[PDB]
């Protein structure tokens, strides 16, 4: 009767619904009883410190468990042959065959092999022993506590910031650009120059010797002379053995381009110069806004002045400043959309341009990292549109936004939604149509009647970057071009070596199979956008519920009248777009993994011929690569892929259990539960025990959330088991 202490409406519910709903509403502080705006920003401030500490505790644990139970020191000696260890296994359910099957990694105990790539990241940035891995763990344990204390401290009466502080847009932007982004990019440049690059060259540099070991022989004298190019002199030779002194240069700031020939990773001196340059640019950016000394910009002034005089945007951005500052959901949506794009850039640029030594020869790590971050990207992208829907319902005031860009969006929302509807159908009819054409034509023994479109636009873009594979002879591929001649003294020689070797993933060769899947990925991006945009733009009202904003973000329906109104809320379009987000990241990660496993075998022609029809995806990708995974145990034994073989079935089970919450709805279940309530009261020796909360069927919205979670969890566990075990089992 007191668990939802933030909600008197739930704490007076006599059912089991109170426990469920109190847990699901706990972090929605805006809806809690008696919430002021002061307290809302102060609880968010403290719980951001608490989240930060969780990230530091998660990182310290990964460092600690590798220092304690890993084979980091053995892996560092021979990184292409040793398989990195994540942590050890202590499971009393194991048989003795399982204990033996997991005793790989060069150790005497059951262990889990790591797919996270943390060995390659810690090696590349300098870590060499277990003792500095543990030193880093200790620092993060300290940092987590410092941020736990800071969270508690800024909840104290004297240290609780005012709303005027929380809404100082110009001072926060100045510090986050120049200090949080810019200075720490500069400080990371310092770490590479002072530690990572010297230890890539055999020389240990730690806290013990850093103040007496110069990063450069000349040493901070060329910098204070303008002879900056003296720091690019003598780069690492192509004979350099990473981690040792042989083949090593003395440069600390280069723009060579391409990959270190032995690690197949970006040069550490390119990376240090990247972070120095980015850091300088960001620090300059962090001086844009006026804080206390009369120079800089008012953000309000810039937005008000950007109304095009032709009048096509109406009042322009007048009143957007107040709308964004007052709406945390508008801020969250911008942050998640921006974060969602970056984590997709991270996935794309880390497989094509790897920075860590000897990664991209770890096919399991390379596959898991891509899959992980595209799935994070799809979740972040859904959340941005969901919180844009929450903004319009809850935080958008149409009278402070008269004729804005925001109000004019809502004025032509049917133009936007119907044109997404057309482009989704346009992509879907023909992308599926060509694939079905190709399947039918290949099934009838006539693969030469397939519709095979060459992706010339992308091939021309590859050639513009110097790819000499399609004879396009444009820009960088052209020998005598203004573009090619301009970059020739810097990165062009190294980049052309990197992009015209067929031994990496920089601008991979593409054909008709890649054309077809990109248009499928285009179909899924526009269709997911459609559901989410329709959810955001119809959130305030529609023709079925013109007063939909009076009911909130998540409500079950408006009942069976007016034809029926199931899934009419803006929340329900988040629900529906979650299936389309899972489908799209499936299409993306299925494509990435099949294209890579066929290349890693040396059989890229298997992808080239089989990707143009759907049976090629079914038999040559899903069915063919299933066999090491589903043989992780059998009546003839088990091996270390037994855990992924079990997670695979586990994922199919959770996914299918979600169907029960999504297909069968409440009325069936409430009537069963009434027969169970009767039987308990009538059964002797059992009616001595009484529920405190009346057992009820899950709510309409809750079952959608429970089924969505089960569907989503089953989706993730199945693919992760497949993408890791099929890659592990093949090694190629």
């Amino acid at each position: 009767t007191k668990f939802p202490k933030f909600s008197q409406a739930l704490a007076q519910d006599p059912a089991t619904r109170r426990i469920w709903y109190g847990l699901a509403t706990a972090h929605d502080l805006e809806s809690h009883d008696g919430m002021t705006e002061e307290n809302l920003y102060q609880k968010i401030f403290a719980s951001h410190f608490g989240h930060l500490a969780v990230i530091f505790l998660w990182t310290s644990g990964n460092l600690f468990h590798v220092a304690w139970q890993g084979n980091f020191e053995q892996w560092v000696l021979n990184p292409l042959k040793v398989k990195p260890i994540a942590h050890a296994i202590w499971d009393p359910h194991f048989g003795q065959p399982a204990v033996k099957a997991f005793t790989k990694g060069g150790v005497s105990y059951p262990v889990n092999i790591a797919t996270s790539g943390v060995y390659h990241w810690w090696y590349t940035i300098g870590m060499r022993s277990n003792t500095d891995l543990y030193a880093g763990s200790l620092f993060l344990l300290f940092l987590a506590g410092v941020f736990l204390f800071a969270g508690w401290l800024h909840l104290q009466p004297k240290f609780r910031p005012g709303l005027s502080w929380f809404k100082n847009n110009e001072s926060r932007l100045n510090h986050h650009l120049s200090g949080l982004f810019g200075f720490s990019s500069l400080a990371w440049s310092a770490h590479l120059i002072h530690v990572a690059i010297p230890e890539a060259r055999g020389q240990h540099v730690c806290w013990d010797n850093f103040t007496k070991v110069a990063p450069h022989p000349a040493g901070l004298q060329p910098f204070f002379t303008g002879n900056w190019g003296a720091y690019a002199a003598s780069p690492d030779t192509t004979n350099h053995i990473f981690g040792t002194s042989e083949g090593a240069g003395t440069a600390i700031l280069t723009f060579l381009g391409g990959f270190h020939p032995q690690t197949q990773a970006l040069w550490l001196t390119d990376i240090a110069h990247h972070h120095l340059a980015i850091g300088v640019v960001f620090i300059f950016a962090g001086h844009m806004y006026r804080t206390n000394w009369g120079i800089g910009h008012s953000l309000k002034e810039i937005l008000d002045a950007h109304r095009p005089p032709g009048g096509r945007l109406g009042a322009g951005h007048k009143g957007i400043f107040e709308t964004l500052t007052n709406s945390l959901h508008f801020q969250l949506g911008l942050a998640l959309a921006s974060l969602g794009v970056i984590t997709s850039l991270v996935a794309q640029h880390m497989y094509a341009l790897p920075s860590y030594a000897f990664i991209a020869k770890d096919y399991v790590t390379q596959s898991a990292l891509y899959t992980h971050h595209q799935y994070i990207a799809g979740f972040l992208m859904v959340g941005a549109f969901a919180h844009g829907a929450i903004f319009f319902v809850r935080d958008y005031d149409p009278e402070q936004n008269k004729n804005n860009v925001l109000a004019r969006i809502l004025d032509h929302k049917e133009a936007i939604i119907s044109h997404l509807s057309w482009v989704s159908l346009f992509l879907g009819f023909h992308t599926l149509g060509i694939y079905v054409h190709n399947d039918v034509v290949v099934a009838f023994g006539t693969p030469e009647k397939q519709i095979l479109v060459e992706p010339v636009f992308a091939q021309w873009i590859q050639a513009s970057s110097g790819k000499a594979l399609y004879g396009f002879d444009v820009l960088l591929s052209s020998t005598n071009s203004v573009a090619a001649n301009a970059s020739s003294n810097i990165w062009l020689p190294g980049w052309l070596e990197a992009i015209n070797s067929g031994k990496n993933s920089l601008f991979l060769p593409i054909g008709p199979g890649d054309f077809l899947i990109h248009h499928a990925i285009a179909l899924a991006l526009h269709t997911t956008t459609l559901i989410l945009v329709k959810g955001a733009l119809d959130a305030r009202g529609s023709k079925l519920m013109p007063d939909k904003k009076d009911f909130g973000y998540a409500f079950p329906c408006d009942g069976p009248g007016r034809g029926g109104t199931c899934d009419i809320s803006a929340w329900d379009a988040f629900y529906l777009s979650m299936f389309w987000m899972l489908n799209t990241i499936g299409w993306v990660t299925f494509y990435w993994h099949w294209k890579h496993i066929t290349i890693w075998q040396g059989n890229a022609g298997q992808f080239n011929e089989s990707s143009t029809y759907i049976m090629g995806w079914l038999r040559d990708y899903l069915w063919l690569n299933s066999s090491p995974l589903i043989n992780g145990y059998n009546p003839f034994g088990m091996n270390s892929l037994s855990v992924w073989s079990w997670m695979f079935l586990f994922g199919h089970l959770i996914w299918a259990t979600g169907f029960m919450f999504l297909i069968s709805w409440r009325g069936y279940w409430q009537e069963l539960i009434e027969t169970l309530v009767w039987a308990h009261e009538r059964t002797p020796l059992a009616n001595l025990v009484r529920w405190k909360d009346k057992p009820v069927a899950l709510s309409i919205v809750q079952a959608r959330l429970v089924g969505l979670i089960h569907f989503t969890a089953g989706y993730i566990f199945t693919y992760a088991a497949f993408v890791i075990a099929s890659t592990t089992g093949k090694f190629g």
């Binding site: 410190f49 608490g50 543990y134 204390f149 508690w152 909840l155």
Partner: peptide, 30 residues
């Protein structure tokens, strides 16, 4: 390699974090 004493240092510092996490959580709970 890591000594057991070194593991015990980590358990002390993580305990200090557990105590600070409780206090931050109680402050957030009010």
């Amino acid at each position: 390699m890591i000594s057991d004493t070194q593991i015990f240092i980590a358990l002390i510092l993580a305990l200090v974090s557990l105590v600070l996490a409780i206090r931050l959580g109680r402050a957030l709970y009010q």
